[PDB]
Design a protein around this ligand. Structure first.
Ligand code: ZN
Ligand code: ZN
Ligand code: ZN
Lengths: 205, 205, 205
């Protein structure tokens, strides 16, 4: 089976199985392992790997999409002695996650979000982009091949294609998404399409 | 099955199944979905995903290769109201495609070509490279980690490793492939090898 | 089966099957083909592809990990006329390999090491990083999105995130891993975790 429990290890005493909304579509060639929650109308495409086997949940909010070859994984959040590693946990609305993906988020082909990380609602994470140890705000755009490592990206900003942002001083001066910006409407279109693809693929299973 | 029809959606009234030349080899761990044409002697490796579920064909010409982890996908080419979105369609020799991959093209491991896009004959698309909203000419070389977004790359040019080309002014001044250039013979060698691998893998199936 | 022999071709007269230590865990959604040796306690994650079908061995040493979506492959090491192509072979301790991955090495999600290449013991190859025609020394760190092409990286150096190193003059001036460097202890932690995950996954198979 491609939907599986995580294994017992010294940093995971109890196996968890994924919690998947009945309206989500998980492609038979995707892999989803461990403590993962997947929301309504989510589409998970071929060759994606969502793997939560180091403690703490990976959460994927409603109407989000995880496209082909995307990887979601996270650093250990509980060490061998049962002690939570706080640096490796993100807090969102009073709850703790290893990776939090909000609602209406697009994780486009071959991107990767590696915990600890949070991605706010209505954000587009572009093809081959990378997010690690970062909080990306709502209504953001990571263009293809951009990356955010160790930073907070404020709401409504975009990172130009290929730019690797590693310092908060850079993240603070990112340009704003405006109506005339080339990717300002991209995520809404991708979400609309993927919500419809998820329902169409569900009707073939 | 790993070779599948696309689903019915408001931008796809009729499911299509892939058309695959009998001499092509599709690895059992690759995924090929929807309106896709694959030419003669093509090799499709493990973990590649070719997904044509948003309208319009993805075409992969003869003696081309789609290596491990490569993704081919495309933006919607017909909106909900049946109206073709012309910006998202490329024209090649009088026919319309979402993605056109020519003959003798190598899409090397983990690269991605996302429609609208066309890649001309005898071109090498290097490892982890990215092509989106671009036309790449014949006899080109995209070195590993290069990218072409929103541009036309003239015939016989190469993009140095890591360079992300987003403006036509840059694409126009790319260097030329000459006989002494390190990758000038790479594609011919890769095509020769992959045509032979496809036949060898076919003899094990 | 996801563990398979390579095919017969003019540059491979005899099929080889992988040699895998009984303590290694190969995920059912990984692919391992051909002349590959995998050492003790190695973890191979979903969607990884290790493909040795062009001649010469790919070796993965003990306690190493090959994470989700990683690709290992190599250029031809024997031409059609039986003649070894010496440029495409690396020598390690008196033996020849197409790709050599040492002991305690982490190949993190979506990275790629393409032969000819060697990676020394206790080295971390970061997420989405790329190594090709290079020798990476022991105790090195390739940060996420870095790349080494055509160079030798001395022992104990790191390549900052996003940096693409293509000339020996650059590789010679890379900074040194010191105790205060942010990734100085990353590999030891990742190895420890992955050795334990491999044993936990083995207990579920
Ligand atoms: Zn990880
Ligand atoms: Zn797409
Ligand atoms: Zn290769």
């Amino acid at each position: 089976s491609n939907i599986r429990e995580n294994p017992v290890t010294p940093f995971n005493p109890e196996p968890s199985a994924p919690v998947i909304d009945p309206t989500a579509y998980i492609d038979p060639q995707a892999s989803v392992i461990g403590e993962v929650t997947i929301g309504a109308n989510v589409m998970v495409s071929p060759m994606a790997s969502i793997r939560s086997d180091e403690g703490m949940p990976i959460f994927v909010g409603d109407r989000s999409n995880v496209q082909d070859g995307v990887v979601l994984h996270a650093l250990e959040t509980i060490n061998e002695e049962g002690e939570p590693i706080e640096d490796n946990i993100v807090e969102v609305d009073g709850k703790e996650y290893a990776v939090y993906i909000g609602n209406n988020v697009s994780l486009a082909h071959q991107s990767q979000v590696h915990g600890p990380a949070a991605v706010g609602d209505d954000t587009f994470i572009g093809m081959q982009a990378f997010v690690f140890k970062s909080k990306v705000g709502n209504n953001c755009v990571l263009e293809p091949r951009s990356a955010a490592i160790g930073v907070t990206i404020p709401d409504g900003r975009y990172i130009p294609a290929g730019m690797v942002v590693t310092s908060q001083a850079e993240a603070d001066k990112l340009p704003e998404v405006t109506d005339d910006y080339a990717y300002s409407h991209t995520n809404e279109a991708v979400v609309y399409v993927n919500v419809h693809l998820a329902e169409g693929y569900k009707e073939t299973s």
